[PDB]
Motif scaffolding. Structure first.
Motif, PDB file in Angstrom:
ATOM      1  N   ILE C  54      12.019  50.310  71.744  1.00  0.00           N
ATOM      2  CA  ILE C  54      13.208  49.473  71.633  1.00  0.00           C
ATOM      3  C   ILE C  54      14.345  50.268  71.004  1.00  0.00           C
ATOM      4  N   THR C  55      15.544  50.106  71.561  1.00  0.00           N
ATOM      5  CA  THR C  55      16.709  50.923  71.255  1.00  0.00           C
ATOM      6  C   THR C  55      17.586  50.250  70.200  1.00  0.00           C
ATOM      7  N   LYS C  59      18.714  46.577  69.294  1.00  0.00           N
ATOM      8  CA  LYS C  59      18.705  46.052  67.932  1.00  0.00           C
ATOM      9  C   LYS C  59      19.951  45.221  67.651  1.00  0.00           C
ATOM     10  N   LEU C  62      19.807  41.971  69.558  1.00  0.00           N
ATOM     11  CA  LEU C  62      18.874  41.048  68.921  1.00  0.00           C
ATOM     12  C   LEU C  62      19.502  40.402  67.694  1.00  0.00           C
ATOM     13  N   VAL C  63      20.161  41.212  66.864  1.00  0.00           N
ATOM     14  CA  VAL C  63      20.743  40.706  65.624  1.00  0.00           C
ATOM     15  C   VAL C  63      21.847  39.702  65.929  1.00  0.00           C
ATOM     16  N   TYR C  66      20.357  36.435  67.168  1.00  0.00           N
ATOM     17  CA  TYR C  66      19.729  35.630  66.126  1.00  0.00           C
ATOM     18  C   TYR C  66      20.774  34.962  65.240  1.00  0.00           C
ATOM     19  N   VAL C  67      21.818  35.704  64.859  1.00  0.00           N
ATOM     20  CA  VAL C  67      22.849  35.109  64.011  1.00  0.00           C
ATOM     21  C   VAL C  67      23.620  34.042  64.779  1.00  0.00           C
ATOM     22  N   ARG C  70      21.493  30.992  64.631  1.00  0.00           N
ATOM     23  CA  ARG C  70      21.553  30.385  63.306  1.00  0.00           C
ATOM     24  C   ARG C  70      22.858  29.620  63.108  1.00  0.00           C
ATOM     25  N   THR C  81      13.670  30.485  63.517  1.00  0.00           N
ATOM     26  CA  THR C  81      12.993  31.181  62.427  1.00  0.00           C
ATOM     27  C   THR C  81      13.219  32.683  62.518  1.00  0.00           C
ATOM     28  N   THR C  82      12.953  33.400  61.423  1.00  0.00           N
ATOM     29  CA  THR C  82      12.797  34.845  61.527  1.00  0.00           C
ATOM     30  C   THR C  82      11.575  35.192  62.366  1.00  0.00           C
ATOM     31  N   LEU C  85      12.797  35.455  65.715  1.00  0.00           N
ATOM     32  CA  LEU C  85      13.305  36.805  65.947  1.00  0.00           C
ATOM     33  C   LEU C  85      12.174  37.773  66.285  1.00  0.00           C
ATOM     34  N   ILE C  89      11.742  39.792  69.839  1.00  0.00           N
ATOM     35  CA  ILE C  89      11.453  41.224  69.866  1.00  0.00           C
ATOM     36  C   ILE C  89      10.233  41.484  70.740  1.00  0.00           C
TER      37      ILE C  89
ATOM     38  N   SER E  69      10.123  29.476  56.587  1.00  0.00           N
ATOM     39  CA  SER E  69      10.664  30.719  57.122  1.00  0.00           C
ATOM     40  C   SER E  69      10.672  31.853  56.104  1.00  0.00           C
ATOM     41  N   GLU E 209      25.596  33.916  56.496  1.00  0.00           N
ATOM     42  CA  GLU E 209      25.805  34.705  57.706  1.00  0.00           C
ATOM     43  C   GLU E 209      25.385  36.155  57.508  1.00  0.00           C
ATOM     44  N   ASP E 212      21.432  36.876  56.744  1.00  0.00           N
ATOM     45  CA  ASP E 212      20.675  36.878  57.990  1.00  0.00           C
ATOM     46  C   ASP E 212      20.833  38.196  58.738  1.00  0.00           C
ATOM     47  N   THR E 213      22.035  38.780  58.730  1.00  0.00           N
ATOM     48  CA  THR E 213      22.238  40.057  59.410  1.00  0.00           C
ATOM     49  C   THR E 213      21.412  41.166  58.766  1.00  0.00           C
ATOM     50  N   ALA E 216      17.700  40.553  59.658  1.00  0.00           N
ATOM     51  CA  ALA E 216      17.401  40.911  61.040  1.00  0.00           C
ATOM     52  C   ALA E 216      17.394  42.420  61.233  1.00  0.00           C
ATOM     53  N   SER E 217      18.397  43.108  60.681  1.00  0.00           N
ATOM     54  CA  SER E 217      18.461  44.558  60.811  1.00  0.00           C
ATOM     55  C   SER E 217      17.266  45.220  60.147  1.00  0.00           C
ATOM     56  N   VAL E 220      14.189  44.712  62.388  1.00  0.00           N
ATOM     57  CA  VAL E 220      14.223  45.562  63.575  1.00  0.00           C
ATOM     58  C   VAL E 220      14.007  47.024  63.194  1.00  0.00           C
ATOM     59  N   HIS E 223      10.510  47.530  62.829  1.00  0.00           N
ATOM     60  CA  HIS E 223       9.965  47.641  64.178  1.00  0.00           C
ATOM     61  C   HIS E 223      10.234  49.016  64.772  1.00  0.00           C
ATOM     62  N   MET E 224      11.275  49.698  64.288  1.00  0.00           N
ATOM     63  CA  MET E 224      11.529  51.074  64.701  1.00  0.00           C
ATOM     64  C   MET E 224      10.352  51.963  64.327  1.00  0.00           C
TER      65      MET E 224
END
Ligand SMILES: Nc1ncnc2c1ncn2[C@@H]1O[C@H](COP(=O)(O)OP(=O)(O)OP(O)(O)=S)[C@@H](O)[C@H]1O
Ligand SMILES: Nc1ncnc2c1ncn2[C@@H]1O[C@H](COP(=O)(O)OP(=O)(O)OP(O)(O)=S)[C@@H](O)[C@H]1O
Ligand SMILES: [Mg+2]
Ligand SMILES: [Mg+2]
Lengths: 53, 97, 210, 150, 247
Positions: C54-55, C59, C62-63, C66-67, C70, C81-82, C85, C89, E69, E209, E212-213, E216-217, E220, E223-224
């Motif tokens: 995944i690039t 990313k 995806l972010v 998700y935001v 929300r 939910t997270t 997310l 993914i 969550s 806001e 959450d960013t 999420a980052s 991910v 996940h990298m």
DNA sequence: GTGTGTTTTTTTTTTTTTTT
DNA sequence: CACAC
């Protein structure tokens, strides 16, 4: 008024097999307008039986 | 009572109060067990005896126990403004002993 | 904990019912290009050989997705939910696994997001909540209990200005305080009041306030 | 004569009645008290001409109505249920898959209505017909310890 | 010897406390208070005993209440996968035996050890603490207070030892936390058992806001491939060395 | 010829007990 | 008990 009266594909399978049995008793390939009419009459009679009175 | 796995008959084995005979028995959380379990100790704490009349076995054991119990007031806190019976879930005969 | 929940329905409508029943009749007539079998090992070969990667553009996609979910769900009502997310993914990784690309492209991200969003609008009510799924007590249900607890507290205070059993509480709540609400809500709210120590319940019978 | 009998057979069996002995060591334990068995010699069961005859019945008797009453002659009324029983006895045929040729009906009825008699009659008239109550099917495994059957 | 040098660097470090706090659960962003509480629970106290024979608990019992969550289950997974002699369990009581123990008849009565027994001298990671009924919560009242369970059911009577650290993770009442009510109100769990819990950690999923960013980052980026100041293997040796201390 | 070795069984049915 | 080891 009762929700059990909903028609389903299972009722279609039952109708098909009832017509098959009806023609099965009456020679061969008797499934026609008359056969399906008899089967649908019996099915509707059974459905109305649940709603008797 | 229990069926003997080796000789295949009912035999009686003593419980907690039998092993505490002429000793002491301590009951933590006396307010928290089943009432049907709590009522099985009346003869034990008053007559100091255990009578069993089950499965063809009839006898009267002796349990000279000294019962000490610990409980918790209703709601976890004791309301001093109320009578004791209202601050507990137990009855008079269990309180009487 | 299901990434996708499909609300497959058989709602009555004569337009689609005609098509479905006609297809059923064609099926009856049948018995008296598609990879029918190659897929069963094609999927295995994709699972073994292809390792989706995944690039960073994926990313960012995806972010932002998700935001956006929300905020569109946002009293800022919680939504998704997270874990959802994580689900997007994983679905994007699956989309990379197919077509034998082994790289989670940007397109896979929005495809998985669209699938997830459609599923969410499916299993959730018309005002898409994203909370009834994790909890039976929804906001429109939780407001009922939050009303009953304060109603019970105020009724008790009025009674004092002393103790009553459950039936008497039912008499002066379901009759005139409001409509014929469910009875167990009263005791459920009384449990919450016990948690805050505002009132005390004297067994199965009477109950008072501290 | 082997394989000429099944458990569901009511028969008149003729044979030689013989005292099978406890040969070995068990004879000493038991003594003169022997066991017996029958060396069977003969078995008599009890349990398109008919095809032309059933065309004759079809032409003469209206099967839909006449055989309906024939199923439950002692039961008055509910002739349409009897016709449904005829249809179930005949049964559809859709063995090809891609379904099933078994017709199934449930008679919830009402206590006091002769549903049990109808089921008994169906069992006595349907070939391979069995009757049982909801509370007594299923299956069991190795019922006798000795033989240890399957 | 190389591990001796590593341990010497660990102990002589000045920001070692903060570094370990950050090194606890590298898979979780933020919630440094929960990480610190978990680290303290792993370190534990000193299981002293008075001359009169009364034992004093050295185990630490922690209940991390939070919204569904939140990262409660991730914390539990990290603890069970890192802490030795640690088991995971839920409030659903998946095992037939109770959360403490059970007695079962053999076709004689024998003892089946509950989730509280296997994690002895370790951590009992407990999930869905709100899901379990109070009927099982009262069964662990003595276990998490006196570190013992006394059972006399039928022909068997014994007291088993539970010297475990409890890591509870329960959703607040109604699923979502209500800040308008106190911690007692937000949970169905009752006073006597929570008085035995040492720390209570409340974690909420604020509709922020930015937050959450970053969450999420961070997910991910995990996940990298998270860079912890000390690795799990490096951290375990220092935890063992500190457990030898009896301050 | 002195002295052995089997045949030889744990079902189904009650009653109790803990959970559920 | 009694025929087989
Ligand atoms: N239409 C009928 N014709 C003839 N006999 C009938 C009729 N209806 C009831 N009976 C008689 O009623 C008895 C059979 O009733 P049952 O079938 O036992 O009633 P039931 O509805 O099956 O109740 P159950 O066994 O609790 S389900 C027999 O004695 C029949 O002779
Ligand atoms: N701050 C965080 N940092 C990293 N991952 C997080 C964070 N908060 C939540 N997560 C992730 O969100 C997912 C769900 O959280 P969990 O730890 O599984 O808690 P939980 O199972 O949702 O709790 P409940 O009440 O039983 S639903 C997991 O994959 C976590 O790793
Ligand atoms: Mg009957
Ligand atoms: Mg969880």
């Amino acid at each position: 008024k009762f929700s059990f009266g909903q028609a389903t594909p299972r009722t279609l399978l039952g109708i098909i097999r009832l017509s098959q049995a009806l023609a099965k008793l009456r020679l061969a390939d008797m499934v026609d307008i008359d056969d399906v009419e008899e089967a649908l009459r019996l099915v509707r009679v059974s459905k109305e039986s649940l709603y008797q009175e | 009572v229990r069926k003997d796995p080796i000789t295949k008959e009912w035999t009686l084995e003593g419980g907690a109060l039998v092993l505490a005979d002429k000793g002491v028995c301590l009951i933590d959380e006396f307010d928290k067990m089943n009432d049907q379990d709590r009522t099985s100790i009346h003869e034990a704490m008053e007559q100091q005896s255990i009578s069993i009349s089950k499965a063809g076995i009839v006898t009267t054991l002796q349990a000279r126990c000294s019962i000490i119990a610990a409980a918790n007031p209703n709601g976890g806190r004791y309301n001093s403004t109320l009578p004791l019976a209202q601050n507990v879930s137990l009855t008079e005969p269990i309180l009487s002993r | 904990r299901f990434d996708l929940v499909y609300l497959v329905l058989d709602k009555v409508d004569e337009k689609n019912d005609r098509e479905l029943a006609k297809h059923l009749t064609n099926l009856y007539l049948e018995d008296k290009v598609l990879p029918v079998e190659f897929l069963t090992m094609y999927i295995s070969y994709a699972k073994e050989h292809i390792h989706p990667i995944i690039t960073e553009a994926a990313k960012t996609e995806l972010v932002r997705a998700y935001v956006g979910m929300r905020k569109m769900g946002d009293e800022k009502r919680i939504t998704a939910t997270t874990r959802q997310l994580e689900s997007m993914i994983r679905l994007a990784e699956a989309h990379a696994k197919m077509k034998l690309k082994n790289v989670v492209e940007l397109e896979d991200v929005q495809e998985a997001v669209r699938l997830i969003r459609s599923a969410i609008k499916d299993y959730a009510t018309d005002p898409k909540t994203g909370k009834i799924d994790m909890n039976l007590v929804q906001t429109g249900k939780s407001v009922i209990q939050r009303k009953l607890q304060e109603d019970l507290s105020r009724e008790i205070m009025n009674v004092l200005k002393d103790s009553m059993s459950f039936n008497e509480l039912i008499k002066q709540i379901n009759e005139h305080s409001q409509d014929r609400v469910e009875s167990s809500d009263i005791q459920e709210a009384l449990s919450r009041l016990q948690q805050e120590d505002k009132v005390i319940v004297l067994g199965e019978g009477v109950r008072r306030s501290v | 004569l082997v394989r000429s009998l099944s458990p569901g057979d009511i028969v008149d069996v003729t044979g030689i009645f013989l005292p099978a002995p406890y040969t070995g060591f068990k004879a000493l334990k038991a003594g003169l008290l022997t066991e017996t068995y029958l060396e069977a010699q003969f078995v008599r069961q009890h349990k398109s001409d008919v095809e032309e005859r059933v065309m004759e019945l079809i032409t003469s008797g209206d099967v839909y109505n006449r055989l309906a009453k024939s199923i439950a002659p002692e039961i008055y009324g509910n002739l349409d249920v009897k016709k449904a029983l005829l249809l179930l006895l005949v049964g559809g045929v859709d063995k090809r898959v891609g379904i099933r040729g078994d017709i199934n009906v449930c008679l919830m009825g009402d206590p006091g209505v002769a549903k049990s008699q109808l089921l008994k009659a169906i069992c006595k008239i349907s070939p391979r017909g069995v009757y049982t109550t909801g509370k007594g099917t299923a299956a069991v495994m190795k019922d006798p310890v000795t033989d240890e059957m399957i | 010897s190389d591990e001796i040098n590593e341990l010497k660097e660990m102990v002589k470090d000045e920001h070692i406390y903060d570094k370990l706090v950050r090194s606890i659960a590298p898979a979780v962003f933020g919630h440094e208070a929960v990480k610190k509480g978990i680290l303290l629970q792993m370190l534990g106290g000193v299981h002293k005993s008075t001359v009169e024979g009364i034992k004093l608990r050295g185990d630490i019992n922690i209940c991390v209440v939070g919204d569904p969550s939140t990262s409660k289950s991730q914390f539990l997974k990290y603890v069970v996968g890192f802490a030795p002699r640690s088991v995971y369990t839920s409030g659903k009581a998946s095992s037939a035996a109770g959360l403490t123990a059970a007695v079962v008849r053999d076709e004689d009565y024998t003892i089946e050890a509950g989730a509280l027994m296997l994690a002895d001298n370790g951590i009992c990671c407990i999930d869905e603490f709100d899901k379990m009924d109070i009927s099982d919560q009262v069964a662990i009242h003595e276990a998490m207070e006196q570190q013992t369970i006394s059972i006399a059911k039928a022909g068997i009577h014994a007291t088993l030892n539970a010297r475990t650290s409890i890591l509870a993770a329960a959703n607040p009442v109604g699923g979502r936390y209500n800040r308008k009510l106190s911690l007692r109100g937000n949970l169905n769990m009752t006073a006597p058992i929570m008085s035995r819990f040492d720390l209570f950690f409340v974690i909420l999923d604020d509709c922020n806001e930015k937050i959450d960013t970053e969450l999420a980052s961070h997910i991910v980026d995990l996940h990298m491939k998270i860079e912890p100041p000390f690795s799990a293997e490096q951290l375990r040796r220092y935890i063992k060395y500190a457990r030898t201390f009896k301050p």
